[PDB]
């Protein structure tokens with residue numbers, strides 16, 4: 309996708325990541341494990357939640373169409389009325405469908421960007437103390453226990 | 469040792485579409501289109517509908533003798549005319565501007581009858597009836613006919629002092645023969661006039677047999693109008709007039725709908741009503757009907773409008 313992370317160079321998702329959309333997985337002597345990154349995830353939750361609310365707010369207004377009765381000699385007025393109703397419906401249906409299709413693309417690309425931004429944040433922090441394996445992982449050049457791992461996650465890793 | 473960045477994958481089967489791809493798998497999505505309804509006619513935030521099962525709107529307005537149950541007046545959110553409603557104009561004839569009348573009526577949220585011309589004011593017979601009307605007659609008008617082989621010129625007046633507009637009705641009889649004409653009005657050449665400060669209408673009969681309807685060859689042309697506050701209605705006739713008797717005071721504004729269906733009604737309340745049923749929802753759209761009214765979402769003719777919330781669902785396996 310646009311930002312190259314999701315279904316990109318980080319080929320698959322993690323079923324083990326249950327708390328949120330984005331996170332970290334580490335591997336050291338003490339073992340392997342993963343956890344969602346709260347900061348990035350909560351920020352994404354607020355934005356999309358906000359987008360949903362605004363879409364609902366902007367599009368829930370109704371339009372009124374009354375099935376008026378017309379006499380034998382009002383065939384033209386009848387066609388004119390039908391033209392109005394048909395276009396009101398077609399235009400709003402078009403707006404509704406496109407808004408959803410287009411925003412769906414942005415939503416998907418934003419999650420992709422959030423993953424990319426998180427990956428680049430860690431790469432920046434690690435500096436030359438690690439090398440990218442090209443799949444979303446950073447092979448550290450020094451032993452790094454859980455406490456060390458935590459500094460990378462909470463962004464206080466020493467030696468940026 | 470190493471640390472990796474990743475994203476969530478789930479067993480969600482939810483998918484969404486975009487302009488450059490369809491059925492994209494996603495971890496979380498939200499359906500924005502409401503598609504359910506209760507299959508019933510209910511009351512809305514404006515009240516209960518006026519359900520007409522034997523009488524048509526004009527039958528009610530003119531007081532067809534078979535619609536007595538409605539004489540006391542009603543108030544409604546919307547109107548429902550069942551396909552069984554067939555009691556309209558019992559005596560053969562047509563209503564001028566019927567569509568406008570039915571529309572004007574349905575737009576109000578209530579009616580209350582008001583007497584315009586008391587039976588006493590007439591100097592001629594006023595209780596004429598017909599077999600076409602259950603051996604009776606309209607409660608909104610009086611079929612004036614001669615009394616004692618005499619039909620003096622009738623000239624009555626009424627002034628709207630109710631501070632509200634009054635919808636009133638009247639008719640012009642067209643006998644099938646000259647004998648019936650003289651027989652009812654004493655003369656073959658009559659002149660009827662209905663007037664106010666605004667309108668000035670006059671009518672003259674045209675005797676002759678029309679095709680049979682309700683076992684009759686004669687006819688009555690029906691009319692209506694609205695006497696505004698302060699205005700004065702006046703009727704003069706020397707025959708053929710079907711005088712205004714009771715009028716209606718219309719009030720408020722309803723949803724202004726006339727649903728012609730036999731859908732079941734129930735003891736229910738909904739925010740949004742349609743001819744197929746009602747619904748309650750917080751979703752922005754619905755695909756139940758473009759005719760929906762009340763407190764409704766926006767109608768959209770589609771089966772689904774699934775909005776992406778989570779990210780692309782990519783299975784590792």
Ligand SMILES: CC(=O)N[C@H]1[C@H](O[C@H]2[C@@H](O)[C@@H](CO)O[C@@H](O[C@H]3[C@H](O)[C@@H](O)[C@H](O)O[C@@H]3CO)[C@@H]2O)O[C@H](CO)[C@@H](O[C@@H]2O[C@H](CO[C@]3(C(=O)O)C[C@H](O)[C@@H](NC(C)=O)[C@H]([C@H](O)[C@H](O)CO)O3)[C@H](O)[C@H](O)[C@H]2O)[C@@H]1O
Nearest residue numbers: 593595596597598599600611613614643644648651652686
């Ligand atoms: C009894 C008789 O002679 N029958 C006549 C009928 O007579 C009506 C006439 O004299 C008028 C004139 O004032 O007075 C009616 O009396 C009313 C009375 O004032 C009122 O107090 C009481 O409540 O109601 C009655 C009736 O409403 C006399 O009844 O006149 C008609 C027309 O000349 C004669 O023709 C035959 O009519 C047959 C249809 O019958 C009715 C009907 O439509 O049901 C009977 C109704 O009573 C009558 N209504 C009125 C107000 O007259 C109508 C009406 O005259 C016609 O619809 C007009 O077209 O007729 C049938 O059509 C048959 O084929 C005709 O030969 C009838 O014999």
Ligand SMILES: *[C@@H]1O[C@H](CO[C@@H]2O[C@H](CO)[C@@H](O)[C@H](O)[C@H]2NC(C)=O)[C@@H](O[C@@H]2O[C@H](CO)[C@@H](O)[C@H](O)[C@H]2NC(C)=O)[C@H](O)[C@H]1NC(C)=O
Nearest residue numbers: 506511512513514735736737738739740746747748749763
């Ligand atoms: C559909 O909604 C009816 C009332 O509409 C709105 O309902 C919401 C509930 O989320 C309420 O907060 C709003 O105040 C209300 N809007 C109005 C008109 O102000 C529901 O009607 C209720 O029905 C119960 C039945 O026992 C009755 O006791 C309540 O008085 C009545 N409320 C109103 C306002 O009439 C209706 O139940 C609901 N339909 C469904 C499917 O439950």
Ligand SMILES: *[C@@H]1O[C@H](CO)[C@@H](O[C@@H]2O[C@H](CO)[C@@H](O)[C@H](O)[C@H]2NC(C)=O)[C@H](O)[C@H]1NC(C)=O
Nearest residue numbers: 454455456457458459460461462463464465466
């Ligand atoms: C990020 O994680 C590190 C490691 O857990 C935290 O650093 C420790 O902070 C405590 C304070 O309670 C100190 O007593 C320890 O000495 C620190 N550990 C070491 C050796 O680094 C750090 O506080 C966390 N920072 C944030 C922003 O949460």
Ligand SMILES: *[C@@H]1O[C@H](CO)[C@@H](O[C@@H]2O[C@H](CO)[C@@H](O)[C@H](O)[C@H]2NC(C)=O)[C@H](O)[C@H]1NC(C)=O
Nearest residue numbers: 588589590591592620621622623624625704705
């Ligand atoms: C019916 O007849 C009565 C009396 O013949 C009419 O009443 C009179 O009408 C005149 C003119 O409108 C007034 O000047 C009198 O004050 C009225 N007095 C009476 C006798 O009531 C009445 O207007 C007639 N109504 C009809 C059917 O035209």
Ligand SMILES: *[C@@H]1O[C@H](CO)[C@@H](O[C@@H]2O[C@H](CO)[C@@H](O)[C@H](O)[C@H]2NC(C)=O)[C@H](O)[C@H]1NC(C)=O
Nearest residue numbers: 501502503504754755756757769770771772773
């Ligand atoms: C409104 O939306 C529904 C659901 O998307 C449309 O589809 C039918 O929905 C029912 C109930 O969910 C299913 O049982 C049917 O199989 C669906 N039919 C098809 C082929 O779509 C429904 O048609 C829409 N209503 C209107 C009036 O268009």
Ligand SMILES: *[C@@H]1O[C@H](CO)[C@@H](O)[C@H](O)[C@H]1NC(C)=O
Nearest residue numbers: 323324326477478479480785
């Ligand atoms: C997810 O689906 C797979 C295969 O259908 C299944 O083995 C696994 O148990 C599921 N995960 C959960 C949370 O049940």
